[PDB]
Structures are given as C-alpha cells and as structure tokens.
Amino acid sequence: TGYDLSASTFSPDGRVFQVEYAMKAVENSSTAIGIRCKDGVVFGVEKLVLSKLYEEGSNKRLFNVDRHVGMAVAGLLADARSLADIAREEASNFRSNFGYNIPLKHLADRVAMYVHAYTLYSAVRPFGCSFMLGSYSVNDGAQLYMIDPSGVSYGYWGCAIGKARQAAKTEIEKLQMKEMTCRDIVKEVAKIIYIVHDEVKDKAFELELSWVGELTNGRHEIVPKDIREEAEKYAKESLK
Amino acid sequence: ADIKAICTEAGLMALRERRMKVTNEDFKKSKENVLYK
Amino acid sequence: SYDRAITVFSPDGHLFQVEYAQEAVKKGSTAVGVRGRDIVVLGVEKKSVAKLQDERTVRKICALDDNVCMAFAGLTADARIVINRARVECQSHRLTVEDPVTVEYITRYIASLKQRYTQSNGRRPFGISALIVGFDFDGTPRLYQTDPSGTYHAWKANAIGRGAKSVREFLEKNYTDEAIETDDLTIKLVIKALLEVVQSGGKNIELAVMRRDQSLKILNPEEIEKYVAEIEKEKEENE
Amino acid sequence: GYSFSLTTFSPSGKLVQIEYALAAVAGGAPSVGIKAANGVVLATEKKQKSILYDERSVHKVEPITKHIGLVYSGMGPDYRVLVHRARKLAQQYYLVYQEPIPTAQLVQRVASVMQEYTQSGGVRPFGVSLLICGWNEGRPYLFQSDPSGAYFAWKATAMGKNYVNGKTFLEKRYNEDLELEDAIHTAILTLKESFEGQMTEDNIEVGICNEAGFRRLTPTEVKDYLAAIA
Amino acid sequence: GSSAGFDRHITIFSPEGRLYQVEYAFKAINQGGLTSVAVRGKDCAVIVTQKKVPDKLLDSSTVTHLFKITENIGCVMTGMTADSRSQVQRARYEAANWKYKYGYEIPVDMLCKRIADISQVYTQNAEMRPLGCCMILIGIDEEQGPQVYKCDPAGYYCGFKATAAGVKQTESTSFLEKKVKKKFDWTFEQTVETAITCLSTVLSIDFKPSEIEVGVVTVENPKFRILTEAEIDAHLVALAER
Amino acid sequence: SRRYDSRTTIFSPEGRLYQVEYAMEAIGHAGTCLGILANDGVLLAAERRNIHKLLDEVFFSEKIYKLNEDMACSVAGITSDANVLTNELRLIAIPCEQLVTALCDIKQAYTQFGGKRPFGVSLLYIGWGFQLYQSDPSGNYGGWKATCIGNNSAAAVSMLKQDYKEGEMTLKSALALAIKVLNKTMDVSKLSAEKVEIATLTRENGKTVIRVLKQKEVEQLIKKHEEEEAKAEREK
Amino acid sequence: NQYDNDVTVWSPQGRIHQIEYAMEAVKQGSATVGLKSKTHAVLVALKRAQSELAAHQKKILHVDNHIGISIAGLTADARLLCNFMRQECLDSRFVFDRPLPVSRLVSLIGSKTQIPTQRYGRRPYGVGLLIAGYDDMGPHIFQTCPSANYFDCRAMSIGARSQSARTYLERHMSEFMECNLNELVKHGLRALRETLPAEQDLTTKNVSIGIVGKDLEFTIYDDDDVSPFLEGLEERP
Amino acid sequence: YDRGVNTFSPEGRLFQVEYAIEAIKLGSTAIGIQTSEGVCLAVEKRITSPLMEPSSIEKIVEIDAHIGCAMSGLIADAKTLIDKARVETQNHWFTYNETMTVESVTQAVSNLALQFGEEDADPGAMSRPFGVALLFGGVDEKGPQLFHMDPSGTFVQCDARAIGSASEGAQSSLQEVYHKSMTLKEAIKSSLIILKQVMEEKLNATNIELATVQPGQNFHMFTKEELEEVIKDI
C-alpha cells in the first residue's frame, strides 16, 4: 500500500509501520529476561546454539557498555552490537566530560534518543533490537531500563524481551523481587528461562547469566561458572 | 491534416464570398483559422 | 547536492540515457564534414530559415581555437556548454605546452567530458554529437566525430544529424582521391552531400571552411549559391 | 535531505503543487486589505473554535518593522516562518543601509523566499498568501505575495475563504479618495459578508498603517469601529 | 479527500490543499491511549494526565508524562512516548540556550513558538515525519501571570485558559468550556479540582492516588513541581467529600 | 527518496526533456510579449494580464525589466521564476549576447544536473549595435529582428514574417507594427492602452535611453492604427 | 516485492530482504572450511575456475602475521574488507606494538559491515569471511556474515554446498582439539571433499590451505605446497 | 527506476554488475594468449564504414612499456580504467623505482570497479559499473602474464582468454589450440585464425589489432606490414 515502506511516512491511523515491523524482529528472537532485586539486577538470556559448531560464548547477547552498566539484547544482533557501541561511547563521553560513571537513567535516556533518531527519516531504518540496561550503585541503587526499537525507555522491576516475553513476564510476577537478593534471583532467573524455553521448538540453548549489585561492588560481571551451574541445576530440578 | 484543413477552410472562405476560385487571401485567412486561434 | 544515478545499465546491458541522448542527436540539423587534402570542410543544414532570425547568433559551426573548429547536431543549449568547456581547455593546453591543441586532444577531452556525464551522479548525458575538424601542427587535416556515449573516431568524411545515414551512404560512394583533388571539389562534395537531405537548396546550407595556416572562413550565401550553380551545371553534362 | 524538486511542471504546463498550495490559501480565514489615501488597513477573521483559546496569545496581524505589517490567509504555522524571515530580511536591509526597508523591497525579498521553496529540493510551497502593507515616501503601499512567489500591488483586495465575492464587494465599495477610517469601515464590511455568526472585538483582528507607522488595533479600538457597522 | 501522487506519503499538498501526513500525526497522539488536561486559574496553572501501569513489573516511578523543562516551566506529553522525549529534550535545550543567549528565563509563549517552529519544518520538508506528540507547557510569567500553551505536531500553537490533549481531548474540551463559561477565577485548589474532575468525568474512572499525575505552577512559588501521592490524595478526598 | 524523485533532468525515450517542454507550455499560456528591431531603436511590447481595476500601478513596468544601463528585458511565464532570472541577470552585468549566454548557461544547468525543475520563463532582451534576443527554459537563445513569445506567439510571428520589411524600419514603423500585431493576437477588439505595455530602447546623445511609453502616448498609437485600419476599409 | 528493493525497508515479518539477498552471495561462492585445534587454526578452501584455461580464483588472503581469512562471495567486496582488516591490524602495530586480537578485529568488521545495512542507498558487503587467527587466547575461527553478524566457531564451512562439510565437521568436532597439525588439515580437506560432487576430487589446482599456530606465522599453501597435505588422505568411498 | 544501483537480487547477484556483464557481449571480440615467449593480444576493430579511419579505433592500449591492455564492451568507459592504470603505474615507479607487476596493475584497476554508489558517495564517485572487460598482458618477475578483468571487479590470470561478442565461440576454439609449451608465433597465428572465423567482416591487416609483450622487449603495436606477414598465411 506504500504506507509501510519508510519510517518518515505515517499510516492513516497514525502509526509508523516500519518501527512496528522492526519490533517484530525482537519478537522473533530468543527471550532475554532481567529482574531487579533489592541489591542489584540479574540478567538472564536464553542463548540458543543454531549448530554445535559455534563455540561456548559465541553470539554473546550480554554486553558491558560500562564498568557498572550491563546490556541484554534481543532481536537482530548486529544492531544490538552497534547500539552497544553507541551505549559504550555514551558512557565514555559522560565520564570524559562530567567526571563520573553515567547514571542509568541518563544512559537509557541518551541511547533511546539515538534509537529514536532512526525512526524519523527515510534515509535510515529503525534498529531491529530491543535491549535492557541494568546497573547498581550505592547512591542511585539498582536500576533496570528497557529500550524498544521505537525509543521508549521505562524502568522495570522485571522485564523480558523476545518471543517468550509474555510467558516469561507471568513467571516474573510470581517473584517478590523487591525483597530477595541477587544470589536468590540468579536461581529464579535460570528457572524462568528454562520454563519458557521450548524444547520441541528451537532447542539446545545456553544459559547466559550476568549481574550487577552490591555483591560485585556495583560492577557488571558475568555470573561465575560455579554459581551459574548451581542456578542451572536448580532450574533443571524445578522442571521435574 | 493541417494542409488538408488549410485547403478545406480556404474553399469555405470562397463559398462564403460566393466564389468558385480560391484566392491567396482565402488561403491566407485559412492559415490564421486552422493553424492559429 | 543531487546525487542520483541518472544513467544506469538496462538488463540487456544498454545505457538507455546514452541511447536516448543519441536519439536527440538524430532530431538535430544534419551536419556534414569532409576532410580534404589541404582543406577541411564543415557543412551544416540550417533547418528552417526564418527571415526575421539573425543568422549570426544561430550558428552550429563554432571555432574552439585558431586551428580547430567543430559543428554539432543535437540540443543547441547542451552543445554550447561543450564548446565553452573545450574553448577553456584549448587555452589551458596552450599555456601549458606552448603549442596549439591537436585535433585528437580536443576531441579526446570532449569525448571524455561526454563519458563523465554518463557515469556521474545527478547528471544526464550531453545530447549532442560533434564534428571536430582542424589541422595539426604538421599540417595534416583531421576530422573527428564524437557521440553522447563518449566515443571518438577519425573520419575521412562523416555526417551527423537527422539525415546522417543517407549522407554517409552518399559519402561512402563519392569520397575519392579525385573528389578531394582541389579545394573547390572538396567544397562541392559537402554541398552534394548536404543537398541529398536539404530540400529547398543552398538557402538552407551553412558552409564553413578552414585551410592550412588559416582561420575558419564562413562562406557567404552568394558563394554557396555560386557553388550550387556549378553542381547544377555539372549535372546537365552528366545526363 | 531530498535534493530533488517536489514541484514539477505538469504536461499542460502548470506547477501543480503551487495550485494546490493556493487551494490551501482559499480554505484559510478571510483577510481584507484596503489602501486608503492616508493609510492602509489590514483585517482578518481571528475566530477560534472554542472560548478556551486565548485570543491575545497568537496574533494574525504582525508587524515587521515600525512601518510594515503582515496579515495572511492559509496555514498558520507557515505564516510564522515567513514572519521571521521577513523580520530577518528587514534587519539585513536596515543593517547595511541604516534606513527602514521599503515596503516594495520587503515584498520582493519575501516573495523570493516563497519562490525558493517552489524550486528547492525536498520542500513544499508555503500554503499562505501574505498581505503586506506599509508607508514609504509619504505614500501608502499594499501588496500580496502568493505561494508561487509572485507579488501584486493591490489597491484593495481580499484573500482566504470567500475571497472571490470579497474582491467583487471591494470593486463597488472602494475609491481612491477613501480615508483611513472609512477604509477600516469598508474592511470590516468586507469581512462581514464572508463572516458567519457575529463579529466581536476579539474574533477579528485589524491593523492599520499611516505616517505614524504600523500598529495593530487593540480590541478596545476594534470595538469602537465595529459599533459603526451596526 | 482527493489524492494526486505522494500526497499521503510525504508532507506535500493534496489537490484540495491538505497535508495528510501532518493530519496522520494528529491521530498518532491518540495511539498512547492517554488524556492530558491543563487548566489555568487566577494565580496557578495545573497539568493533569492519567498514568497507566499495566503490570506491577513496570517501575511506576518512571512512567511519567510530566516533564520539568526548566525550573519555572513544566509540560505534559501526549502521543508517542519516544517522540515526546525528543520534544522535551529539544525544549530543554532551547530553554537553556535562551537563558545563555538572552540572560533571562524563556517565556512560556516563546518556548513552544520555538518548538512549533521546529515542528513546522517537519511539515514542510519531506524527508522526515512530523513528531506524533502534543506538548502543553504551563508556567508563571513575570507579568502576564499563569500561562498554558498547547503545541501540536503541525506547528500550531495558542494560549489556553483550559486545554486538553489525547484520546478524550474533545470530550474534555466541552467540559472545560462549560466551566470557563461560568467565569470564575479559580484558586489553586479549584484549578486542581476542576482539572482532576475534567479527567475524572470524561473518563469515568474515580481516580485513585496512583492513576494520575498533577503538575502545578503557582505565583507564590513560580517553580514546577510534581504532586506526590499524598498531596494528590488530599484533592481526591476533597472531591469525594463534596 | 528514489520513490519520490520525479527525475526532472533525464531523457525521455524519444530524446526529449519533458520538463523543458512542459515549461515551454507554460509560456504559451502566459502574456504575449513582442520585440521588433528597427534601424534607430528596439521596442518591447508585452501584453498585460494584471488588468484588474483594483490593481495598483506603482512599478515602472510589470513585465519589462531593466538589466543594466544599456539593456532591458521582458519575461513570459512563471513571474516568480522571472524575478530570480532578472535578479541574476543584473548580477552578471557588457555585450547583449554575452548577458543572454551567461543566463542561458544557468538555465541549461537546471535541465542537465541538480534535479530541480527548469525555470519556466522565456525572456525577450533588447539592448545596444541594436539587437533583440529570445531565450527559452532549455537555455536555447537566438537573435531576432522581430519575434514574439507568450500567448498566440505563433500567430504574431506569422504576422511579423509577412509585414516586417527587413532593414527599412524606423521606430515609428516598428511601433505601429507592434500595435497591429498585438491587435490580432489579443482577444480584445479595441486593445486599450491599459492592456498593453510598450518600452522603447534608443541611442541618444551617445547614451542608451530605455523609456516606457506613457498611457497617453500608447493611445495615440492605438488611435493611429485604428484609423489606418479603417482607411483600408474605405478601399472595400 | 516492495520490501526487497532497499536495505532500509523492514518486511512485515521483521526481516530485511536485501540483507538476506546479500547473504545468498556467500552461498553462491565456493566452499571453504575453517577449523581449529588446541594450538592451530587452519583454513581449507576450494578454488573455482571459470574455464579450464583460466587460473583458480584465490580464496585465502593474508591479513596480518597472525590473522588469515578465506573469502566467499564478491571478490571486489572481499578486497574492500580485507584491506580494511589489513589496515586495522597494521594500525594496532603502529600504536600498541602488539598483534590485534582476532576477537577485537571481527568486532570492528562486524560494526563496519553493519553501517551499510542501515543507511539508504547502501548495500551489505556481499562476502562471507572465515577468519583464522592465533593470539594470547589461543586459536580462533570466526565466520563473518553479510548481515554484520559474526560467530566464534569451533569449525565452520561456508560457500556452495557447505552444509555437507558442516555435517562432517559436526561429526568429528570431538577429535579436533587434541589432533596435531597434520590431522587437523586432513579433517578440513576431508570436510571440503563433502562439498564436491561424486566425480570430482581434491586436486592441487583447486585446494588452498592456510595455517596459523602458536609458534607458526600465517602461511598460505598452493598447488605445489598442497601436495604434502593432499597425499595423506585416502580416497573417499 | 525504483531499484538503486547497489541492490542485490534474490539470487545474490548485484543487479548493475550483472547488467554491465551483458554489455561485453555487445562489444568486439578480444583474444589474449599467454605464452612462455610472451603474451599476444588480438582484437577486432569492427569497421562500420569505409570512411572511418581504422587507426583511430584504439582497442589495445599501452598501459606501460611492459604491460598492455585489450578492451571490449563500452570503449568510452575503459578510458577511465586505462588512465588510472597508467597513473597507478608510474606511481609505483615513482615510489619504488621498479615496474609494477601485472597482477598488481590489474588489482588496482579492479578496485575501481564496484566503487559506484547513489547515496553517501563522493561527488566524483561513479554511478554505474564500467561495462568493459579488460585483458591485461605483460611481462614481469613472474614472466609473461595475462589477466582478465570484468565489470564485477573479479580479476584472474588466464592462460588463453577470449572476451567480447564471440567470447563463447573463441574460448572453445582457444582450448582446442592452446598448449602450455608453444611459441609466440603460434599464439599470434592461432589468435588470428580464431578471430578470422568469428569476425563479421573479412580479416585483413586494417580491421584488427595485434599486440605482443615479450621478455626483454617492450610492448609492441603490430603495424600493417607486420600484420600482413602473418595474415598472408591464415
């Protein structure tokens, strides 16, 4: 009909279809959940292996845009990596100008505007990835923001992005995330990922785990393998 | 078509003036009708 | 800036914008050039001669330099840009090499300028074809023809314009060493070639000549009418 | 940005986008300008769709210099862009000549801006027609700048909705001996024929130019003029 | 409703003189499904909008359509959330630039008059789409007093005694028009009450002190503040008791 | 971008520039503009289409513009595009042919590269020897002894092709010829002075004089021609 | 369709057809196999000849002293990418006086290739790269896609009929780590044999092998130098 | 049209690149043979009129004293590629005081191909591919070498490559006559035999071009007298 071929054209109902179509790429990717607990944020991504040939660590959907802010992505991975570099350069510029680690609220509000800038013109296409940014500091506290391809950034207590987002959200709501800590959440984040995974559908997933909290001194790090395996065992046992 | 229209109109000018012989003035007034206006 | 690919390859492998530009050449007035022994000749059909038109301003034969002149066929506005561009480069070559430009060089530059417009963003091809004539520094007469694609060839005698095919067929049969023996015979060959497509006669013929160590000379209508009488006279004795 | 012209010639030799821009002008609020012997008047229908709108917040009749005024008929946002450009252009003339810009000179500069958007790439013509009034050399001036960029010197004209009948009304009601006050009376009368409902001091905007310069009539002043109508 | 060419895809005129792309941006304001109401009183201006938190997972402290453009100027955004933040960020930059360049706080009228100028370019150049958001600035002027200005995607702008934007804009406009007809210079308490009532009556929600956001500017304190749930509950309690 | 591009500066399959031809159609619907060369001066008679009786008469001429001290021009087509070309024309100004060629290079540029629409203006130039020039949106320019552009230009050129005695014309003969040619071209049977616009260029005291004939002077030309035409009626 | 003419148009199914169309250029290219061990990372390529009177198109290109790639797709696009990675590897030596890590290089070409897949009028790099390198982290085999998405692979095969080699690589992926250099190259040659038709065979003319190891520079082997590797493997059943 | 220049087909083909490849089939047939004694280049002028001077049709171009190029397809497009080749050469000589290898010269010209774009390109950037196939032939450290270039930027060394209108027919005949160990005289003779069979006109010393680059000797344009000597046989 021609109303959906550009991001600079509005549908007669006032909706930008190119941005909506870009959101569909996120809904075709594997789910990535992030839960904000009392003293941090834990990121869990269901990372499938399309073949046994890829090494353990390929297609890392968990990025480190700053020493205190993580990034869990869903959708097209190339634009996820490009937005990770944009988030990386936004944090570096903030430190090089103001002299301290960039707040998550400002980082989310800054990267989202770059994402939004690609949803206005026909010269560029909207980003095909949605990502969650998590951080922890003693002053600001645990924060978790999700930015969609349109450019909407909202703080979250538990968020899920991907094809199993809707099922994952229901499992997150059961959790009393405002009271438990990171060490307890990492077990549940694994459990939610294993529950929403479809074994008859696309199978052979690798559980990617990351967190940032007071137990890491406000530093976003990959969950240690020893804790990660313990979380994996708890998740597998929960499926009976 | 313009040539035939020039001649046909030129004869019509002679028919108006009740003549069988088409003059240059009849053809001259013919061009200003079919080609112009 | 407008950066759009006007000239692109057709699926068959043709540059249609180049081909369409060549079609505009086929709608222009017939220009005929004959390269003789000691003289080079350019003959251009004057299309329609309105009595109220200043014949000086409308001129399809222009001198790029003191030893090189060309006649074009196509879009009149497009040609003038090429002529001015060539005229500027004629002086640039003269200031650098301290020698008048050879007929190859100004033909090569014009053809290269034409090709650049068939492979540049935002530019449509020039819709004119040029008949470049002149003398080199050694006095060798040279005649060259360029087309909107950007290709150039040397011709003993050639025609461009609406009646190019018929005149070139005529030139294929009458261009001999005898027919270019003298300057007058070389002049008569162009008129014979031009009269094949020009209907009324010498009134619609604009002929300009250039001799060795001499500037471009435009023939007055009486001189052309004098020549036309000779061909008409020579036609009777051959019957 | 797009580098290709969005206004092109139709096969019948018309700039079609310009004609559609003029259609937007014909759908705008009526604007009437009358050039009297001692001044010029500019009147327009500043009627809002509710009482919630602040009438005095946005003015359709805006001054350009101390002696030049604008009033439009067409798209509101497009007129504010042309107001700033005209005010910028007047300052450029004032800076280099140290003399207030002539009314005629401003129209040419403003119409050149309007013409540019007809030929420039990736842009549409302004959907307004500018009625320009001024006072130079002790003589009143009134001009109209169409979306196409062509400017006409008008003794009395009307634009916007119902402008065809408004022009006819001015034909039988205007003479070169009209004074400024009678021109205001005639300008209000021209609006009234195209006006629907009742004309208050707030739903119409009047601005006049004389030797003292251009000033927009306050709602109190317009009320006094409106009383003479009834 | 005639069309000729790309008059529905780029900001070019229709045969009848219409910009459909700009019109479609107005329908984009209703895509969020939220209604905002702004009411101006004798010495205060109030912006009221509904906040929807579909799930407890969302941090309700972040879902805010009320933005502090500067200390003395606040706005409520209706439409696309992504486009709204860009306008707010653009409005903040222009407010800061005005303070630096001119030495005094930017007037409310000139703030959108700039913003409407930016959004007008979107309606004239065809390589970008209009921002599908509506901006309503409220602030206390030095001399004119309380000011309310709606700032639409088309580059239009006007002052308002009481305005509304969103899905229920015309339903709320009729309600506010009736209240203004009574010609009452409302106090600060009354302006909040009529703003809450306007959103309450039109939507028929009977608001709780977690479902709307109230931002007020008063002459006594010409600064823009967000009403807390405790402060917002006092007005809702006052509404219920009367 | 590619979708919305009209591709103004491209070639039609027949080798034609459609935008140039369509612009040339706009001039055909414009006001009639004449130009006649004489031995002592050049004139430029243009049909006035701004003939509304509420139109103020403030400018020196409506379609006749002075480019430099030695040159005057008249336009036909989009009047807004004419202002751009006339403003540029004064910037370049110098010989008459040089000025026309310089502008025609600008006009040809819009028909070859840039993607913009061509300048839909045809101009008639008069200057000091005495010469008359006509330009087209394609940038094609040519000198003329007598030529016309605008409404019924073909009809006017035919009249000039028959009644322009080459070489043996003064201003008075050329001025009278302009009125007679304008009379048939115009739909008005009277052709009052308010619907026409005549400007004459002459050399006086070693200086070029560009003067627009007053309404009183034109009425004498209309009166003289109508009596001269009525004199021919006495023959029949 | 209307969603496949540009790389900036999202299909209603959340796909970019121009990106996927550029991905098919790799599938049109000849098969290359890249596999690694605990100490080596080799590349085995099957060169193609347009005619028997023309040479076989080179498929393995030397990028740096420790990094080597095998191309698959548009040769001109491969040179544009290979020159870029050559410059970036050279720039690391000029600044840090250290070899550029392979993981840190593919990220750069994964971001360099992402820009054209998002801007109007640009096209994705119609080439697929199999990057083999050695650094402090050990041997690496990276596969580069025209979609600007790269994979850190134990053993990958790209090109025409490459999935037949992916099967062989998957079956014998367990014995890749502990096998020596000679056995590692033979596995790639055996894997590359699966991409050939039944009547064809691995010959010195159409086989190129590139090796990078712990103490070994990246060297490319050709017709004369493939003989020490080709004679070991037995004829296929 | 709606399609841009840098657009991929559903089969992974660059549309403009494939279309430019079809343009070569409309050009004249060029034959290049690589021989241990040297590289021979043959091409047909395709005279279309007796008045046209055959000397003006230069389809074999001296790139340098040790390398020559034969062109087919759009001759006007090859001038830009030839000029860059003649500029890239003498730039290697300026900086390294040595003659550039034939492979490197072809590689440099190949990079010019595919450097065409519509948006986000330099003002001097090209808009369409070069619809000309080049046949570089010369002598270097590796001895005589013949390289074939196509509008796709793909260059490859060829023992005996025929490009142009009769590329399909001449290549089949080339395979039937080419052996690795022959003399240059046989290579010149065989190229003329194949050309004579594929030309529309009759083969003579004025409608063809023959070029040889021998080791020690320089690039040499065969004259009419030299051409008549080999044509008089067959």
**Option in D26, D77, D125 nearest E155 (CB):** D77
Helix C76-97 vs helix C103-117: angle between axes, to the nearest 10 degrees? 130
| A129, A83 Cβ separation under 8 angstroms | yes
> What are the start-end ranges of the E strands in chain C?
31-35, 39-45, 61-63, 68-74, 128-135, 141-146, 152-154, 157-160, 205-211, 216-218
For residue F95, what are the contacts with CB-CB under 8 A and spacing of at least 6? Answer: none
DSSP string computed for chain A? --SSS-TT---TTS--HHHHHHHHHHHTSPPEEEEEETTEEEEEEEEE-SSTTB-TTTT--EEESSSSEEEEEEE-HHHHHHHHHHHHHHHHHHHHHHSSPPPHHHHHHHHHHHHHHTTSBTTB---SEEEEEEE--TTT--EEEEE-TT--EEEBSEEEESTTHHHHHHHHHHS-TTTS-HHHHHHHHHHHHHHH--SSSS--EEEEEEEEEGGGTS--EEPPHHHHHHHHHHHHHHT-
Q: Which residue of B has its CA nearest to F153?
A: B36
Sign of CA dihedral F209, F210, F213, F214: negative
| Domains of chain G, first to last | 1-234 (3.60.20.10)
CATH, residue E91: 3.60.20.10
The answer to whether H4 contacts F2, with C-beta atoms less than 8 Å apart, is yes
Spatial separation of the C-alpha atoms in residues E199 and E190, rounded to whole Å: 14
Chain E positions in Cβ-Cβ contact with residue F117 (cut-off 8 Å)? none
The answer to whether E6 contacts F3, with C-beta atoms less than 8 Å apart, is yes
What's the CATH superfamily of F1-234? Aminohydrolase, N-terminal nucleophile (Ntn) domain (3.60.20.10)
Cα-Cα-Cα-Cα torsion A59, A62, A67, A68, nearest 10 degrees, comes to 170
Chain G positions in Cβ-Cβ contact with residue A9 (cut-off 8 Å)? none
Chain E positions in Cβ-Cβ contact with residue F4 (cut-off 8 Å)? 6, 9-10, 126
The SS3 assignment for B4 reads helix
F with E: touching (≥3 Cβ pairs within 8 Å): yes
Q: Assign residue E49 a region: left if phi > 0, alpha if psi is -120 to 50, beta otherwise?
A: beta
Interchain CB contact of F189 with A (< 8 Å): no
The count of other CB atoms within 10 Å of the CB of residue C49 is: 14
Cα-Cα-Cα-Cα torsion E70, E76, E77, E82, nearest 10 degrees, comes to 50
Residue H171's alpha-carbon distances to B13, F188, H69, in angstroms, are 75, 78, 18
Question: How many residue contacts between A and E have a Cβ separation below 8 Å?
Answer: 102
Lookup: tokens for C146: 């360029």
Resolution in A: 2.9
The count of other CB atoms within 10 Å of the CB of residue E97 is: 12
Lookup: tokens for H200: 């529309």
| H206, H54 Cβ separation under 8 angstroms | yes
Measured distance between the N- and C-terminal CA atoms of chain G, rounded to whole angstroms: 45
The answer to whether F27 contacts D13, with C-beta atoms less than 8 Å apart, is yes
Spatial separation of the C-alpha atoms in residues C133 and C154, rounded to whole Å: 10
Q: From the CA of F140, how many Å to the nearest CA of chain H?
A: 28
Q: From the CA of F1, how many Å to the nearest CA of chain A?
A: 7
Q: Assign residue F191 a region: left if phi > 0, alpha if psi is -120 to 50, beta otherwise?
A: left
For residue E213, what are the contacts with CB-CB under 8 A and spacing of at least 6? Answer: E48, E49, E51, E64, E65, E66, E76, E226, E227, E232
Spatial separation of the C-alpha atoms in residues H162 and H43, rounded to whole Å: 9
DSSP string computed for chain H? --S-SS-B-TTS-BHHHHHHHHHHTTS--EEEEEETTEEEEEEE-----TTB-GGG---EEEEETTEEEEEEE-HHHHHHHHHHHHHHTTTHHHHHSSPPPHHHHHHHHHHHTT-B-SSS--TT-BSS---EEEEEEEEETTEEEEEEE-TTS-EEEBSEEEESTTHHHHHHHHHHH--SS--HHHHHHHHHHHHHHH-SS---TTSEEEEEE-SSS-EEE--HHHHHHHHTT-
Element of type H or E holding E78? strand E73-79
Chain G positions in Cβ-Cβ contact with residue A73 (cut-off 8 Å)? none
The answer to whether C2 contacts F12, with C-beta atoms less than 8 Å apart, is no
What range defines the domain where residue H145 resides?
2-234
The answer to whether A157 contacts E61, with C-beta atoms less than 8 Å apart, is no
CATH, residue H28: 3.60.20.10
| Domains of chain A, first to last | 1-238 (3.60.20.10)
> What are the start-end ranges of the E strands in chain D?
31-35, 40-45, 53-54, 62-63, 68-74, 128-136, 139-145, 151-153, 156-159, 204-210, 213-216
The answer to whether D20 contacts E158, with C-beta atoms less than 8 Å apart, is no
Interchain CB contact of E80 with A (< 8 Å): yes
Spatial separation of the C-alpha atoms in residues C208 and C68, rounded to whole Å: 12
For residue H22, what are the contacts with CB-CB under 8 A and spacing of at least 6? Answer: C9, C11, C12, C13
Q: Which residue of F has its CA nearest to D33?
A: F54
**Option in D24, D51, D77 nearest E13 (CB):** D24
The answer to whether H119 contacts F1, with C-beta atoms less than 8 Å apart, is yes
Chains that touch A (3 or more CB pairs under 8 A): E, F, G
CATH, residue D23: 3.60.20.10
Chain A positions in Cβ-Cβ contact with residue F1 (cut-off 8 Å)? 122-123
DSSP string computed for D167-194? HHHHHTT--TT--HHHHHHHHHHHHHHH
Alpha helices, DSSP H, located in chain B:
2-16, 24-34
Q: Which residue of E has its CA nearest to F5?
A: E6
> What domain count does chain E have?
1
Lookup: tokens for G180: 């020596």
Q: Please name the amino acid found at residue G222.
A: D
For residue E210, what are the contacts with CB-CB under 8 A and spacing of at least 6? Answer: E51, E53, E60, E229
Spatial separation of the C-alpha atoms in residues C220 and A219, rounded to whole Å: 94
For residue G99, what are the contacts with CB-CB under 8 A and spacing of at least 6? Answer: G64, G65, G66, G67, G89, G92, G93, G135
Spatial separation of the C-alpha atoms in residues G87 and H123, rounded to whole Å: 25
Residue B25's alpha-carbon distances to B9, B11, B16, E34, F230, in angstroms, are 12, 11, 13, 82, 19
Strand order from edge to edge, sheet including A158-161 = A158-161, A32-37, A40-48, A205-213, A221-222
Obtained via which technique? cryo-EM
Q: Which residues of F touch C (CB under 8 A)?
A: 2, 5, 7, 9-17, 97, 101, 104-105, 107-108, 111-116, 131, 133, 138-147, 157, 160-161, 164, 166
Residue B1's alpha-carbon distances to B9, C152, C234, G163, in angstroms, are 12, 42, 39, 71
The answer to whether H2 contacts F2, with C-beta atoms less than 8 Å apart, is yes
Spatial separation of the C-alpha atoms in residues F230 and H219, rounded to whole Å: 87
Query: Phi and psi for F216 in degrees, rounded to 5?
Result: -65, -45
Chains that touch G (3 or more CB pairs under 8 A): A, H
Q: Which residues of F touch H (CB under 8 A)?
A: 1-3
State the residue for tokens 């010639």. Answer: D9
Q: Which residue of C has its CA nearest to D2?
A: C2
Residue of H9, H17, H51 to mutate for C, most C C-beta atoms under 10 A: H51
For residue F201, what are the contacts with CB-CB under 8 A and spacing of at least 6? Answer: F41, F42, F43, F44, F72, F126, F127, F128, F130, F208, F209, F210
Residue of C8, C18, C169 to mutate for H, most H C-beta atoms under 10 A: C8
Spatial separation of the C-alpha atoms in residues A13 and A7, rounded to whole Å: 14
| G158, G31 Cβ separation under 8 angstroms | yes
> What domain count does chain H have?
1
Q: From the CA of A121, how many Å to the nearest CA of chain F?
A: 10
The answer to whether A53 contacts G173, with C-beta atoms less than 8 Å apart, is yes
The answer to whether E10 contacts F1, with C-beta atoms less than 8 Å apart, is no
Interchain CB contact of E126 with F (< 8 Å): yes
Q: From the CA of A18, how many Å to the nearest CA of chain E?
A: 12
State the residue for tokens 């080597």. Answer: G68
**Within the 1-37 window of chain B, which residues sit less than 8 Å (CB to CB) from chain F?**
31-32, 35-37
C1-239 under CATH 3.60.20.10, yes or no: yes
Q: From the CA of D27, how many Å to the nearest CA of chain E?
A: 8
Q: From the CA of F1, how many Å to the nearest CA of chain E?
A: 8
Sign of CA dihedral C211, C217, C222, C227: positive
Question: How many residue contacts between A and G have a Cβ separation below 8 Å?
Answer: 96
D with B: touching (≥3 Cβ pairs within 8 Å): no
Strand order from edge to edge, sheet including H155-157 = H60-64, H67-73, H132-140, H143-149, H155-157
Chain D positions in Cβ-Cβ contact with residue E176 (cut-off 8 Å)? 52
Spatial separation of the C-alpha atoms in residues D230 and C159, rounded to whole Å: 83
The answer to whether A128 contacts G10, with C-beta atoms less than 8 Å apart, is yes
B with H: touching (≥3 Cβ pairs within 8 Å): no
Query: Phi and psi for H13 in degrees, rounded to 5?
Result: -95, 135
Spatial separation of the C-alpha atoms in residues D73 and D25, rounded to whole Å: 6
Chain C positions in Cβ-Cβ contact with residue D3 (cut-off 8 Å)? 1-4, 122
> What domain count does chain D have?
1
Question: How many residue contacts between D and E have a Cβ separation below 8 Å?
Answer: 99
Interchain CB contact of F55 with B (< 8 Å): no
Question: How many residue contacts between C and D have a Cβ separation below 8 Å?
Answer: 8
